[PDB]
Design a protein around this ligand. Structure first.
Ligand SMILES: CC(=O)N[C@@H]1[C@@H](O)[C@H](O[C@@H]2O[C@H](CO)[C@H](O)[C@H](O[C@]3(C(=O)O)C[C@H](O)[C@@H](NC(C)=O)[C@H]([C@H](O)[C@H](O)CO)O3)[C@H]2O)[C@@H](CO)O[C@H]1O
Ligand SMILES: CC(=O)N[C@@H]1[C@@H](O)[C@H](O[C@@H]2O[C@H](CO)[C@H](O)[C@H](O[C@]3(C(=O)O)C[C@H](O)[C@@H](NC(C)=O)[C@H]([C@H](O)[C@H](O)CO)O3)[C@H]2O)[C@@H](CO)O[C@H]1O
Lengths: 191, 191
């Protein structure tokens, strides 16, 4: 997996658009939706099961976590997945992030703030990799790239992000219940 | 999986470009290449392992199997995957296609001509589904969408296309040795 392209994606700035002014699926044959907030618009690709969530028409109170791609699509700035339902109320939750270095092994523990009731895997993946780039030298060297991030739910279900490669596009639009995240366990296979 | 978008895709015309005048990967951060032949140009997305075949710069001796997408990308007509090495010899082979109707039903056999030494899964998938629409009422209506196409190779390796949904984008750029295809087996679970 191209290391230039990997760190380049995770080093990019993100745009958190809460409560979009609009989200429009022009037609079911389109593989995306036009979103806009505060006189700025974007086209957001629907490349996974997220496509089933936005039938033709307008949809209110959606959120978008954007990471702007290199490609312009339908004449607009483009991002893939990262859509979710806006919050119903003010919300913030603090979960444990436990980072383990592995062969071998005590974890380095910190806290991570969850403010969305419904959150895309794009957002969690992006923010958690930033944290690891800032705090654990992830992608700080060509050898600092192997491991996994595991988001564990209160019911013990889990979602895994493999660090040697980018999150797969068809998973960027998957969402989970942020109010039900129990903890985040990280394995780093490099020192 | 949306039936409308499924059928819309396989009903489309294809454009087969043999020996491109150019194929240009502008930069390693891009997710595609610019291709052109004669005076027509397109942008082709590299969304699977195909991305590793085209580093920055030009690449000669390539073919493109295009199916134009709804989205314009980089101000151009767009297609996903479908790239391959052009033939070095005038290779042609007639492969058996065996259609079995799996309703708990001898196979109905015909021939399918391969003219490329290396062929994208996008091209085989697309042509084989046209044949099945033309001859076996695939996507003729609702309930005419279940089954699979299996491309079998000389060493018993195989490649499968599930008919109930579109070929996955990350597989459109995968290529196989057309000279080693042994047969094509189709199981239709409808009538
Ligand atoms: C080459 C390539 O990228 N191929 C992918 C393949 O990786 C991918 O499978 C998924 O791979 C990820 C790691 O990259 C996980 O292993 C997925 O399993 C899990 C997960 O741990 O995340 C299992 C887990 O039990 C699931 N949780 C629930 C509640 O069901 C999650 C969940 O379904 C996903 O995280 C949601 O995005 O998946 C594993 O599926 C496949 C499928 O994406 O696609 C290939 O192209
Ligand atoms: C929901 C979703 O789309 N998930 C996909 C998941 O389906 C996909 O897995 C592939 O699924 C296809 C059928 O759709 C096949 O079953 C793949 O298995 C095979 C195949 O039969 O095609 C197995 C076979 O042994 C392999 N042949 C060789 C020589 O290795 C092939 C081959 O690797 C592929 O055909 C090449 O594209 O695969 C199965 O992998 C996964 C991975 O694409 O992605 C999820 O997102």
């Amino acid at each position: 997996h191209n290391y230039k392209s990997l760190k380049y994606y995770y080093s990019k700035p993100s745009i958190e658009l809460k409560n979009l002014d609009g989200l429009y699926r022009q037609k079911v044959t389109d593989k995306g939706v036009y979103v806009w907030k505060d006189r700025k618009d974007y086209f957001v690709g629907l490349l996974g099961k997220d496509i089933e969530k936005y039938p033709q028409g307008e949809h209110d109170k959606q959120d978008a976590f954007l990471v702007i791609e290199e490609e312009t699509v339908n004449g607009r700035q483009y991002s893939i997945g990262g859509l979710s339902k806006t919050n119903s109320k003010e919300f913030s939750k603090e979960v444990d992030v436990k980072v383990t270095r592995k062969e071998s092994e005590k974890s380095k523990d910190s806290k991570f703030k969850i403010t969305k009731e419904e959150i895309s895997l794009k957002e969690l993946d992006f923010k958690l990799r930033k944290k690891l780039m800032e705090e654990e030298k992830l992608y700080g060297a060509v050898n600092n790239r192997k491991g996994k991030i595991v988001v564990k739910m209160e019911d013990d279900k889990f979602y895994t992000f493999e660090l040697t490669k980018k999150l797969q596009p068809h998973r960027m639009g998957d969402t989970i219940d942020g109010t039900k995240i129990k903890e985040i366990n990280v394995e780093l296979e490099y020192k």
